[PDB]
């Protein structure tokens, strides 16, 4: 506590340089600190949460301020198809004159960047039309971040610290989250959409100065309190409505139309308002379920205890699964991360099919960035969920309390689970690789008609069951006599069937033999990743090779060379191995999406539809072909706007390759090198007046794996972000 | 850009001076035995 890490003595007494490194690494593991109790930990979590919220809101306010100060939002508002959104301005004293002339595009007076984050369409949809509104939002967000910092400091003072028993009040916390944080927030958003967004879309200005004056419906609040609710769905906007003006706009605030606005090719604002109202009511109703202190309500422990089916098919049921999830923070963290990582892939899969912002789906370089970003975030989150499940199993699981519940029977038969995941992954990989190589040989020998092309009949049948009329299946929504059809014929199918049967948007694109193989490669990737992560999480407490792994912790290098060799054995190493497969799976998914959409936007879908069934087609028609303007970002004849990407791209590669340096070569070489480097420094004149304090040592084993994985991941992300932005924005579809 | 003289004031004060002083402060805090 007298050196850099004051929360640990083992690192304080470390004379080597490692003291620095492991001080930054184990800086947020509040559990494994010195003199930690269950009431300091929770309050530190609370204060760190407040700080995190402050940082998030400061970031958002910075985005607002920088788009308002240097951007061209007002110009973009009146021509959102023939202008490029500016992110911010650049001031680089290393620039040259051609670079200044190249990056000064758009409407700006100097060199600037172009915003590929889609914030322009978002802000324009919800009803922002002037830099003044952006500045007001920015200062308000500065204010709320200051308030969050105030509260974070306040709840650490001795008078106002919450007790550990207050945090564990799961019933009231879930009740209040569900009711307020979801329903009331969705209700407030519905109010804003009704008051400010929809009228500003119709054309009329509505701000704070006239909130209580301008009502959002010619007969506001009368029909509502009288139950005549259809009055708010009388006349919506027509196909002739110009988003922003009143040229053919209705007056309904809530409705169910389905489909896309014919001009903006995005969902109807009134539809979003209605959806938010519905889910707000649903969440508010679902709030009042658990007993807080009012007599009525459930006891979330006796619900768990009551679900042991008679017959002992799964042991003692869920008896005891309340205390484990309540006392252990890693269980809650894993559940939270898994449930969050499923919906942060749901948003990615939805926002491209049903674009929710005005004049999206026409920024062919923004949707790609959004999809790739959210899918990589989802991959990292899904890996973290399993990591924290493993940590829970290692340091939080009590085999005596969890006596014969489901959680114990998962450990009881883990060999079967790992065996079957192994079989599934092996089967998928064998057959996918076999078919791809067979098609490769068939195309190589000049006979393309001998390759195994498989139509995805199940997904095509599903699409036909959603109303698509390409495959002629005529099932359950293409059939005109099915009751499912007649039910929604008056409400929304006129728009849904119209949008889905238009083969120019991303709503249920057509699929052929080339999609089948990529979906199976995706299944193989998912299966192998979950296999690695589940094997780690399960054999994290102990295996036959090392049946005391729980006593050594989460991350430890190895258990010596003996017993045949036990290198790379911990569960942290399972996670480190699974990160590679996560990155590979997400790369496959993003390659598929980007090639499909490039070929859709260009105009020749029959290039993907025909050159993807083999594997050289991916290397030649996607990677090699779409890299012609990227690498030509600068040359002995000049440079152009893509030059920065042409740098970043190469940059990526370098970092990526450097990762290999930390993964192939191991410590015993570098330590024996440092031991002579130190000699050389000591035995030279004029340079032994200086002297190191921390003894120089080679990086540790798990530290080397961590640095290698970090380099690999940074390079993998950068050399693909650069490529996806340059190859698309350099052509714009 | 309204000011247009602030980017010439801040990025030299945030990419050169800010790291130069925070690295020195953190090095004094790291290499001390208290």
């Amino acid at each position: 506590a007298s050196r850099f890490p004051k929360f640990s003595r083992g690192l304080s007494q470390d004379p080597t340089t490692r003291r620095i490194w492991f001080g930054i690494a184990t800086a947020h593991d509040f559990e494994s600190h010195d003199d930690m109790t269950e009431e300091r930990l929770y309050q530190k979590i609370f204060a760190s949460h407040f700080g995190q919220l402050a940082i998030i809101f400061l970031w958002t306010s910075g985005n607002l301020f920088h788009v308002a100060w240097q951007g061209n939002f007002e110009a973009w508002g009146q021509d959102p198809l023939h202008v490029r959104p500016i992110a911010h301005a650049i001031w680089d004293p290393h620039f040259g004159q051609p670079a200044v002339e190249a990056f000064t595009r758009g409407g700006a007076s100097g060199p600037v960047n172009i915003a590929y984050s889609g914030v322009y369409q978002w802000w324009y949809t919800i009803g922002l039309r002037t830099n003044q509104d952006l500045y007001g939002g920015s200062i308000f967000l500065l204010f709320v971040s200051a308030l969050f910092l105030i509260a974070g400091w306040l709840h650490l003072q001795p008078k106002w610290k919450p007790s550990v028993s207050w945090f564990k009040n799961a019933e009231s916390r879930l009740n209040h989250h569900l009711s307020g944080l979801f329903g009331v927030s969705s209700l407030a958003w519905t109010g804003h959409l009704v008051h400010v967004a929809i009228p500003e879309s119709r054309g009329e200005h509505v701000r704070w100065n006239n909130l209580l004056t301008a009502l959002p419906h010619p007969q506001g609040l009368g029909p509502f309190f009288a139950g005549q609710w259809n009055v708010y769905a009388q006349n919506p906007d027509s196909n002739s409505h110009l988003f922003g003006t009143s040229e053919g706009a209705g007056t309904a605030i809530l409705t169910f139309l389905g489909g896309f606005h014919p001009q903006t090719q995005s969902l109807w604002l009134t539809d979003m308002a209605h959806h938010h109202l519905a889910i707000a009511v649903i969440f508010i109703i679902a709030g009042h379920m658990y007993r807080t202190n009012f007599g009525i309500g459930h006891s979330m422990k006796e619900i768990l205890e009551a679900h042991t089916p008679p017959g002992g098919r799964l042991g003692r049921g869920h008896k005891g699964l309340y205390d484990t999830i309540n006392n252990s923070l890693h269980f809650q963290l894993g559940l939270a991360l898994a449930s969050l990582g499923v919906i942060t892939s749901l948003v990615a899969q939805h926002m491209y099919s049903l674009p929710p912002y005005a004049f999206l789906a026409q920024d062919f370089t923004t949707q790609a960035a959004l999809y790739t970003h959210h899918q990589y975030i989802a991959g990292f989150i899904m890996t973290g969920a399993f990591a924290h499940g493993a940590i829970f199993f290692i340091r939080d699981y009590n085999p005596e309390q969890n006596k014969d519940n489901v959680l114990a029977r998962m450990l009881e038969h883990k060999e079967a689970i790992i065996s079957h995941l192994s079989w599934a992954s092996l089967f998928l990989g064998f057959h996918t690789l076999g078919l791809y190589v067979h098609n490769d040989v068939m195309l190589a020998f000049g006979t393309p008609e001998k390759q195994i092309l498989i139509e995805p009949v199940f997904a095509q049948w599903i699409q036909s069951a959603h109303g698509k009329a390409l495959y002629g299946f005529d099932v359950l929504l293409s059939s005109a006599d099915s009751p499912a059809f007649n039910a929604g014929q008056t409400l929304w199918l006129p728009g849904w069937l119209d949008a889905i049967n238009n083969n120019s948007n991303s709503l249920f694109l057509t699929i052929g033999p080339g999609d089948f193989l990529v979906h199976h490669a995706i299944a193989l990737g998912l299966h192998t990743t979950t296999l690695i992560l589940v094997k780690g999480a399960l054999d994290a407490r102990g295996s036959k090779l090392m049946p005391d792994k729980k006593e050594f912790g989460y991350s430890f290098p190895c258990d010596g060379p003996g017993r045949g060799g036990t290198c790379d054995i911990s569960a942290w190493d399972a996670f480190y191995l699974a990160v590679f497969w996560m990155l590979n799976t997400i790369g496959w998914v993003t390659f598929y999406w980007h090639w499909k959409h490039i070929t859709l936007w260009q105009g020749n879908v029959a290039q993907f539809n025909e050159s993807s069934t083999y594997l050289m087609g991916w290397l030649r028609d996607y990677l090699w072909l779409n890299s012609s303007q990227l690498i030509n970002g600068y040359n002995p004849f000049g440079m152009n706007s893509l030059s920065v990407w042409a740098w970043m791209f190469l940059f990526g590669h370098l970092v990526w390759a450097t990762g290999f340096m930390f993964l192939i070569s191991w410590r015993g070489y570098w330590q024996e090198l440092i031991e002579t480097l130190a000699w050389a420094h000591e035995r030279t004149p004029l340079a032994n007046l200086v002297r190191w304090k921390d003894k120089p040592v080679a990086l540790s084993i798990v530290q080397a794996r961590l640095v290698g994985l970090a380099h690999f991941s940074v390079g993998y992300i950068f050399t693909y972000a650069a490529f996806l932005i340059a190859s698309t924005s350099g052509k714009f579809g | 850009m309204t000011a247009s003289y602030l980017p010439s004031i801040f990025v030299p004060l945030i990419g050169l001076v800010f790291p130069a002083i925070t690295m020195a402060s953190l090095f004094i805090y790291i290499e001390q035995d208290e």
Binding site: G51, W69, S138 | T2
Partner: peptide, 29 residues
């Protein structure tokens, strides 16, 4: 922030928020 004083307002507000974050960090350590 098309005006001039508004940038100064943003700067001073950012400074206040920075002092608040400083106090919070000191309390967290």
């Amino acid at each position: 922030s098309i005006s001039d004083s508004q940038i100064i307002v943003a700067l001073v507000s950012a400074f206040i928020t920075g002092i608040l974050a400083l106090r919070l960090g000191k309390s967290l350590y």
